[PDB]
């Protein structure tokens, strides 16, 4: 039955103000985040950055989008995300980023009957990584991904890793030829600026460089 669901989704979006967050003027909306790492393509020492491709999922509850007549989780077309409120999540250390757009924009909206929104994004991000090269090329590097809310303070938005330490998957999927992932960590902070305190999630990797290229390349010559 598609006519009753079309009346249900039109009921959810009628009178929906995208300018207002869920529970506007009340307690902060909690946004839970999961990251599935697709790949780390490049790690550049000259530019001091790294290119990361991931699936970025955000979970929050919007009571304006709660439906009752359907017992299923509504997976909608991704163009409905322009008619919904989404968190203003950005990457603080990110230098250049984009959402994939072939064949459609690489995003997903999945609704739930209590109003829980699953919002996924396929993002390729070139993030800055300041490197200590005093022990190069026998060095270990710590490259982070800083996840922050842009305009909403901690009075309006709260971040958390959804699933605790299992919130980031696909670290074994990373295949760098000159690097190996030693450890990854998940940090949740509040960062205070002049405009207020902002929620912060941090995903950091420890990169151990492989010596085998530099033996053939420089040491043995």
């Amino acid at each position, epitope marked *: 039955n598609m006519s009753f669901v079309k009346e249900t989704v039109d009921k959810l979006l009628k009178g929906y103000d995208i300018r207002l967050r869920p529970d506007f003027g009340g307690p902060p909306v909690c946004v839970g985040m999961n990251i599935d790492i697709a790949s780390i393509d490049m790690v550049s020492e000259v530019n001091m950055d790294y290119t990361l491709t991931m699936y970025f999922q955000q979970y929050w509850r919007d009571k304006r989008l709660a439906y009752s007549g359907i017992p299923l989780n509504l997976t909608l077309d991704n163009r409905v995300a322009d008619q919904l409120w989404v968190p203003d999540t950005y990457f603080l250390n990110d230098k250049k980023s984009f959402v994939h757009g072939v064949t459609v924009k690489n995003r997903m909206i999945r609704l739930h009957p209590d109003g829980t929104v699953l919002y996924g994004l396929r993002i390729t991000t070139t993030a800055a990584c*300041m490197m200590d090269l005093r022990r190069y090329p026998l060095d270990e590097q710590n490259c982070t991904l800083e996840i922050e809310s842009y305009g909403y303070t901690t009075d309006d938005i709260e971040f958390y890793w959804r699933g605790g330490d299992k919130a980031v998957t696909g670290v074994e999927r990373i295949e760098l030829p000159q690097f190996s992932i030693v450890e990854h960590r998940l940090v949740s902070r*509040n*960062v*205070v600026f002049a405009t207020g305190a902002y929620p912060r999630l941090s995903l950091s990797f420890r990169l151990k460089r492989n010596i085998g290229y530099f033996i053939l390349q420089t040491y043995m010559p």
Partner: nanobody, 108 residues
Framework: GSLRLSCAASGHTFNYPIMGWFRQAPGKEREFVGAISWSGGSTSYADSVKDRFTISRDNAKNTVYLEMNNLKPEDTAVYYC??????????????????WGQGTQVTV
């Protein structure tokens, strides 16, 4: 008179490139005094201690020193030394600083 303090660091000081000096008067808030970068040396100061306090460092000893010149009776507090991560924002805010010093009680 002129009093010079000296804060020594050890460990992963590359991920914490900014050292900051804070003070906490008894019954008051923890007040920003000044900040210093390890690599470089770009300084920042509060208005109450500007052109009287000088902060600089040497990267050999991993030592940050706070030279307090032209002392005043409003400078009576436990002076703390703190380290700040790279993607933490705002020098003035002590919540952004992770590793703290012990804090010596200084009364002029």
């Amino acid at each position: 008179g002129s009093l010079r303090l000296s804060c020594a660091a050890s460990g992963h000081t590359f991920n914490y490139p900014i050292m900051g000096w804070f003070r906490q008067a008894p019954g008051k808030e923890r007040e920003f005094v000044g900040a210093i970068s390890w690599s470089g040396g770009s300084t920042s100061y509060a208005d109450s201690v500007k052109d009287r306090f000088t902060i600089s460092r040497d990267n050999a000893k991993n030592t940050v020193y706070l030279e307090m010149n032209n002392l005043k009776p409003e400078d009576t507090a436990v002076y703390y030394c703190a380290a700040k991560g790279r993607y933490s924002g705002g020098l003035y805010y002590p919540t952004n600083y992770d590793y703290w010093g012990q804090g010596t009680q200084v009364t002029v």
